[PDB]
């Protein structure tokens, strides 16, 4: 009955590491925005003080250390991995590719459109939504890998 279970396990192990890395990075971005906004003792979680428009822009778009472009390339890598692992459900891949879009607005980068002049609370919720979309994508790929 089982022959290429090695395919299932190997492909599913690659996906998990990539999904976990991306979510860990997003958790760091949420914490960096919270810490920039408030202080070193800042709690990422709900009902947080000092909403600021500058924290997300500093953390994501700073010219020396900005993480926006890094985040974009990491989501792209993950979305491309999801595409190679999926079956032939365009309609399902088309759903996840839409959740993981990297498209901005006009002559601006995806990172600029999303984090230019954006409140800390809105930036953290946007990042939380991105993690939940990564986790949804992961679950759908896993189901597809089992056949």
């Amino acid at each position: 009955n089982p022959e290429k279970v090695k395919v299932w396990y190997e492909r599913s192990l690659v996906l998990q590491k990539e999904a976990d890395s991306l979510c860990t990075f997003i958790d760091d971005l949420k914490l960096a925005i919270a810490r920039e906004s408030d202080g070193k003792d800042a709690k990422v979680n709900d009902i947080r003080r000092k909403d600021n428009l500058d924290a997300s822009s500093v953390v994501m778009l700073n010219p020396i250390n900005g993480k926006g472009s890094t985040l974009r390339k990491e989501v792209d890598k993950f979305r491309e991995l999801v595409a190679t692992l999926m079956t032939d459900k365009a309609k399902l891949k088309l759903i996840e590719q839409a959740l993981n879009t990297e498209s901005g607005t006009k002559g601006k980068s995806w990172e600029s459109s999303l984090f230019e002049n954006m409140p800390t609370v809105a930036a953290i919720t946007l990042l939380t939504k991105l993690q939940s979309d990564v986790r949804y994508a992961q679950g759908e790929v896993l189901a597809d890998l089992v056949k």
Partner: nanobody
Framework: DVQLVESGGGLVQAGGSLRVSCAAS????????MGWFRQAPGKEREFVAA????????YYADSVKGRFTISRDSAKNTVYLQMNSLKPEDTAVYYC???????????????????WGQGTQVTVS
């Protein structure tokens, strides 16, 4: 507040090996990644190696890559930096640090490390 204790520094000749440890307190290992930084004579401190708590991934400076190994023991709340093929350039003050971050994009950044230890002077001759 978090507290780190350091022990294992020594004097060794070229091509020799050593092992430095760092003591951790409480559940800090679960919430914080552990990093190790060395400060060369008359120079600014630089990152050596880091241990991620999230993925338990290891990160190394390209100058110490292949010679140095970072380890984690959850029960002992201790981190080990195994230093092999030691060169005189490795002579420095080795410092302990904890960061709330867990990804590769933050673990190499000295500024992202909240807590520090005194360290031990390691000499290679």
């Amino acid at each position: 507040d978090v507290q780190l204790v350091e022990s294992g520094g020594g004097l060794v000749q070229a091509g020799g090996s050593l092992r430095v440890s760092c003591a951790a307190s409480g559940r800090t290992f679960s919430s914080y990644s552990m990093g190790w930084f060395r400060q060369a004579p008359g120079k600014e401190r630089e990152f050596v190696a880091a241990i991620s708590r999230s993925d338990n991934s290891t990160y190394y400076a390209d100058s110490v890559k292949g010679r140095f190994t970072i380890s984690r023991d959850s029960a002992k709340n201790t981190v080990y930096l195994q230093m092999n093929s030691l060169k005189p350039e490795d002579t420095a003050v080795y410092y302990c640090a904890a960061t709330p971050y867990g990804s590769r994009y933050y673990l190499r950044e000295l500024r992202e490390y909240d807590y520090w230890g005194q360290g031990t002077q390691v000499t290679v001759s």
